Every structure is written in C-alpha cells, then in structure tokens.
Amino acid sequence: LEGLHRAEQSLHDLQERLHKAQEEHRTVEVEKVHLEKKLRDEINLAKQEAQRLKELREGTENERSRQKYAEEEMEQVREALRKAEKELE
Amino acid sequence: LEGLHRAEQSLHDLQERLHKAQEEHRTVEVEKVHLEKKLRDEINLAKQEAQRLKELREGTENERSRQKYAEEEMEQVREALRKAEKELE
C-alpha cells in the first residue's frame, strides 16, 4: 500500500520526463538542425565565393599586365615609325 | 578569412552537441523507456495481486462462515437424535 502509492508518483514522474524529451527531440533539436544547415551553407557559400573573388582578381591582373606590355611595345612602334617617316623629309 | 575561421568553431561546436543528443536519445532516452515500462508493469502487477488477494481472502471467509453455521446446525441434530433415542430406552 504505502510502498505502491509512492512508486506510482515516481511513474507519473518518469513518464512526464520521457514526454518532455519527446517534446525536445521534435521542437528544440530541430531549430538546432535547421540552423546547423543554414550556418554550414552560409560558410561554404562564402568559402567558395572568396575563391571566386581571388581567382577573378588574379585573372584581370594577368590581363592588365599583358596589356601593359603590349602598350610599351606600341610605344616603340610609334617612335620608330615616326623616325622612318620623318627621315623621308 | 578572419571572420570565417571564427564561426567555423561555432559550426564545429554546434555539430558535436547535435551528435550527442542523437546518441543520448538512442541510448539513454531508450534506457529510461525500458524502466518506465517495467516500473509500470510491476506497479500494475502488484495492484492486480492485491485485488486478487482480497478477492480470495473474502471468498475463504464465507466458505468458512457458511460452514460454521452448518456445524452448529449439525450439532443441534446430534442433540435432538440423542434425546429421541434416549427417551425410547
């Protein structure tokens, strides 16, 4: 009698705990799962975008420099072509 | 790069947690689920046994009182046959 009543309170107890944990692994443990994805996707998106930025900055740099060198040659062309024409008064 | 490395720990830390929960869920929540059931079983088994003990002690008690009223009646017979026979001596 006395022995029972007591243990019962520990059952209706235990039973609510297991039900809160069943409330958590479906409300709490889901905000954390949605979030983990958001975070992981944002991070990977950024890592990949910095690899773009970088690779792009590099590409136009090459192009600039190629164009510069072509221009320094067109300078030489200009001067020498003018010396030719001039010499033929 | 600075602000990334930072949140990367954040994503690693949140990832460890989310892995515990899916393990405690599947090994500790499930251990408390066994125990709730056995506690519930034992509690119920004891209630039915108490009722069954009550039902039987009661049965015994009329099977006993009915048969004590009989022994008294048979006693009266014993005495009435005694006097009848005695008076035809």
Numbering used by the authors:
A (entry chain D), B (entry chain A): 248 to 336
In the authors' words:
To better understand the conformational change of CC1 in the presence of the IH region, we determined the crystal structure of a STIM1 construct (amino acids 237-340, hereafter referred to as CC1-IH) and demonstrated the existence of both the inactive and active states of the STIM1 C-terminus in solution. One CC1-IH mutant (residues 237-340 with two mutations [M244L and L321M], referred to as CC1-IH-mut) yielded high-quality crystals that diffracted to a high resolution. The structure of CC1-IH-mut was determined using the single-wavelength anomalous dispersion (SAD) method. There are four CC1-IH-mut molecules in one asymmetric unit, and each molecule consists of an elongated α-helix stretching from its N-terminal end (referred as the head) to its C-terminal end (referred as the tail). Furthermore, two of the four CC1-IH-mut molecules have the same spatial orientation, whereas the other two are oriented in the opposite direction. As a result, all the tails of the CC1-IH-mut structure are clustered together, whereas the four heads are spread out. The two monomers paired to form the CC1-IH dimer in an antiparallel manner, with a buried surface area of 1,114.5 Å2 as calculated by AREAIMOL in the structure of CC1-IH-mut. Further structural analysis revealed that hydrophobic interactions and some intermolecular forces, such as hydrogen bonds and electrostatic attractions, are present within the interface of the dimer. These interactions mainly take place between the IH of one CC1-IH fragment and a region preceding IH in the other CC1-IH fragment. Specifically, the side chains of Leu335, Leu328, Val324 and Ala317 on one monomer (cyan) tend to exhibit hydrophobic interactions with residues Leu286, Ile290, Ala293 and Leu300 on the other monomer (green). Our current study revealed that CC1-IH exists as a long helix and that the oligomerization of CC1-IH depends on the IH domain.
